[PDB]
Amino acid sequence: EAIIRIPPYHYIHVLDQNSNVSRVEVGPKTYIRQDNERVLFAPVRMVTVPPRHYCIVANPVSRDAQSSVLFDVTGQVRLRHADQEIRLAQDPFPLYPGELLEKDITPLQVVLPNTALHLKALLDFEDKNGDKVMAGDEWLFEGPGTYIPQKEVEVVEIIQATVIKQNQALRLRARKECFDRDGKERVTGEEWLVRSVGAYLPAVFEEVLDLVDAVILTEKTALHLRARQNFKDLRGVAHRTGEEWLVTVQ
Amino acid sequence: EAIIRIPPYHYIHVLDQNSNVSRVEVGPKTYIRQDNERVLFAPVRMVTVPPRHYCIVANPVSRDAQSSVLFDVTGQVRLRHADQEIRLAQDPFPLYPGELLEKDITPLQVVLPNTALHLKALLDFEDKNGDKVMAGDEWLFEGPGTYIPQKEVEVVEIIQATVIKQNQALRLRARKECFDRDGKERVTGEEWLVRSVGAYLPAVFEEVLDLVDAVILTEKTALHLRARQNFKDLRGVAHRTGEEWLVTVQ
């Protein structure tokens, strides 16, 4: 039918095959078609973003300073074919020609007060504070809050804060050379021990091992152990790479 | 038949295939149809919301400041394709075109005076008090009362208040790092003990374990126990990670 026939917050792409300038006809209206405004698709609803949600739209539209959707000399929509635009809660924005929906509408990303997101940047970019973000930096999203899902970052995994009970410690194994909470250089595979009571939130590098509990030392017993390598114990005694000594209640 | 023929609080969608501006014709009347007001469905009743009930309507209608159902330049109803509207007790509101009923009319949500709802937000939003609600926060609906079923929140489970009899205690296991009723940081898996007599309402994080009863200590007997880890008992005595001592009537 030559008459195209639109519901209210709907829009269709008219294929002006005198120019193929496919342009969104934001409804609603009894738009009339010559074969210079050829309709492409159906009156399907094309749902929008509910509050505090996000949708991933392929090939978004380039926007000027006033956030206006630009058109070129022939009237075709100015696109970002090789970009992405994270659309938060907003009106039923017209899907301009080229604008494809990669990910349909999805709920926002939530972290529990003691979980963390391994926020891996996939693409080099600059954060809002604007200091530096390398193409693949690792930074840990903190506890209670909500992250804004961006196109340049990827949530590889959710990191549950492993719990360090008293008389228990976490055998942390870094897989890259870096620092720790205390501040001494932690190298790859160097298993170190943190005794801070609580739910020690693992960093981007700490591979969590088993929770080692403190052995039980009454005056009836003494722990006979061998040092695997040079270090200084909690009491402040230098020990060699295999010297066997006793730790007691004293 | 060219005559459409409506009962009183009924309404039908007329498909103006000169514009397909499907618009609700709120009855009742002897509306007459050219093929520019094409009827879509039947005089089926389309029940409304009884008092203190709620219905979930897909694709609700956008409303202005005066809560008027808007129309666009061609007269098609202004919809919220990507939103929800919780309809409380109200009149037989016209189901405008696009407006679908996700959940049919259902009774309101009730909590017994000592049950609780694990109110999980599915979507990021702001509560009525307006401080902050992250996308997936956990807050416990309290006792005797009624919650308003919202689109942004989900009742995962009903939480029966587990009962702590005297000489009994609850072995609470948090699965996230957080605080407790007393106020000390409770980390994941750290089983702690609450001795407050009553029906201790479990929090959003407390996984309830078995109810441990107080052992029976007459002067005839003494409880010989070993401490699993460093702590301070109720009497205020530091105990090591395996020191075995006796607790008596004294």
CA-based nearest distance A161→chain B, Å:
7
Q: Establish if A90 touches chain B: CB-CB under 8 angstroms.
A: no
* Chain B environment of A168 (Cβ under 8 Å): 229
CA distance A117 to A157: 6
3-state secondary structure chain A: CCECCCCCCCEEEEECCCCCCCEEEECCCCCECCCCCEECCCCCCCCCECCCCEEEEECCECECCCCCECECCCCCECECCCCEEEECCECCCCCCCCCEEEEEEECCCEECCCEEEEEEECCCCCCCCCCCCCCCCEEECCCCEECCCCCCEEEEEEEECEEECCCEEEEEEECCCECCCCCCCECCCCEEEECCCEEECCCCCEEEEEEEECCCCCCCCCEEEECCCCEECCCCCEECCCCEEEECCC
Alpha-carbon distances of B212 from B99, B206, B215, B216, rounded to whole Å: 54, 16, 9, 12
Residue B178 has its nearest CB partner, among A5, A29, A113, at A113
End-to-end CA distance of chain B: 95
CA distance B22 to B33: 13
Residue that the structure tokens 């126990």 belong to = B225
Q: Establish if B13 touches chain A: CB-CB under 8 angstroms.
A: no
Please, is B61 exposed, middle or buried when counting C-beta atoms within 10 Å of its C-beta (0-12, 13-18, 19+)? Answer: buried
Inter-chain touch A29–B19, beta carbons under 8 Å: yes
CA distance A122 to B8: 60
Residue that the structure tokens 């390398």 belong to = A134
CA distance A8 to A112: 39
Q: Establish if A248 touches chain B: CB-CB under 8 angstroms.
A: no
CA distance A113 to B142: 20
* Chain B environment of A166 (Cβ under 8 Å): 229-231
End-to-end CA distance of chain A: 95
The 10 Å Cβ neighbour count of residue A23 is 21
- The pair phi, psi for residue A124, each rounded to 5°, is -70, 135
Best B35, B74, B192 member to test A by mutation, with max A CBs in 10 Å, is B74
CA distance B44 to B6: 10
Peptide bond into A28 cis (omega under 30): yes
CA angle A2, A6, A11 (to 5 degrees): 105
Evaluate whether B14 touches B23 at the Cβ level (below 8 Å).
Answer: yes
Evaluate whether B32 touches B64 at the Cβ level (below 8 Å).
Answer: no
CA distance A141 to A183: 20
Resolution limit, Å: 9.8
The 10 Å Cβ neighbour count of residue B188 is 21
> How distant is the alpha carbon of residue B59 from its chain centre?
21
CA distance B57 to B98: 10
Q: Give the largest Cα separation in chain A, rounded.
A: 99
Structure solved via:
cryo-EM
Residue that the structure tokens 């114990």 belong to = A233
